[PDB]
Design an enzyme around this catalytic site. Sequence first.
Site, short mmCIF file in Angstrom:
data_model
loop_
_atom_site.label_atom_id
_atom_site.label_comp_id
_atom_site.label_asym_id
_atom_site.label_seq_id
_atom_site.Cartn_x
_atom_site.Cartn_y
_atom_site.Cartn_z
N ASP A 17 11.47 -8.84 9.20
CA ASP A 17 10.31 -9.25 9.98
C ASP A 17 9.88 -10.69 9.66
OD1 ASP A 17 9.79 -7.59 11.92
OD2 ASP A 17 8.06 -6.57 10.96
N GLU A 27 7.83 -5.48 -10.20
CA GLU A 27 6.79 -4.90 -9.35
C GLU A 27 6.23 -3.61 -9.95
OE1 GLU A 27 5.03 -5.99 -6.97
OE2 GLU A 27 6.21 -7.68 -6.25
N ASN A 74 2.80 -2.94 0.54
CA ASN A 74 1.37 -2.93 0.84
C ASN A 74 1.00 -2.27 2.16
OD1 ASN A 74 -1.03 -4.77 2.04
ND2 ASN A 74 -1.32 -4.41 -0.17
N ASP A 100 -9.20 -5.42 -1.69
CA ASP A 100 -9.33 -5.71 -0.25
C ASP A 100 -9.17 -4.47 0.62
OD1 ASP A 100 -6.61 -5.21 -0.31
OD2 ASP A 100 -6.05 -7.12 0.59
N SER A 106 -6.63 -2.46 0.52
CA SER A 106 -5.23 -2.07 0.66
C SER A 106 -4.71 -1.58 -0.70
CB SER A 106 -4.31 -3.21 1.10
OG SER A 106 -4.22 -4.18 0.06
N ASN A 130 -6.01 -2.32 -4.44
CA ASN A 130 -6.53 -3.66 -4.33
C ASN A 130 -8.00 -3.63 -3.87
OD1 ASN A 130 -4.01 -4.97 -4.97
ND2 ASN A 130 -3.34 -4.26 -2.92
N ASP A 183 -0.91 -0.96 -2.94
CA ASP A 183 0.51 -1.25 -3.04
C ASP A 183 1.21 0.00 -3.54
OD1 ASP A 183 0.17 -4.02 -2.43
OD2 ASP A 183 -0.34 -4.34 -4.59
#
Length: 129
Positions: free
Chosen positions: A101, A35, A59, A48, A50, A46, A52
């Site tokens: 989650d 990562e 994220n 979009d 967002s 990103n 990381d």
Amino acid sequence: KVFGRCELAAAMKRHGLDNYRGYSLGNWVCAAKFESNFNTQATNRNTDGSTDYGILQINSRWWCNDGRTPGSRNLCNIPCSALLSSDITASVNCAKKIVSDGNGMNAWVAWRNRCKGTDVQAWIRGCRL
């Protein structure tokens, strides 16, 4: 900070990640390797909206709040900047939440592509834990 493999393994061990939800410690070290290349300050912005963050590239749409991401849920209840510390505690605590989650380690694209189906024990072989 850029961690060493064994240094990171021990820190993750101290934080309870070995066999957390059935995932041995080497899975976690492997995921961090691919990562972020063990860099606690890694960021990937990103298209979009967002971002990381940190050693496990968590994220900002679902897990932490950076105040700039649309549809933010902040399910780890933390500012994303807490995930950029040299101390890995916030990232580990949030990573535990990501598994709790309901998803497993498939939440980390690098884990699924580069660790799944490999000898993850190699990542902690030779280390003092």
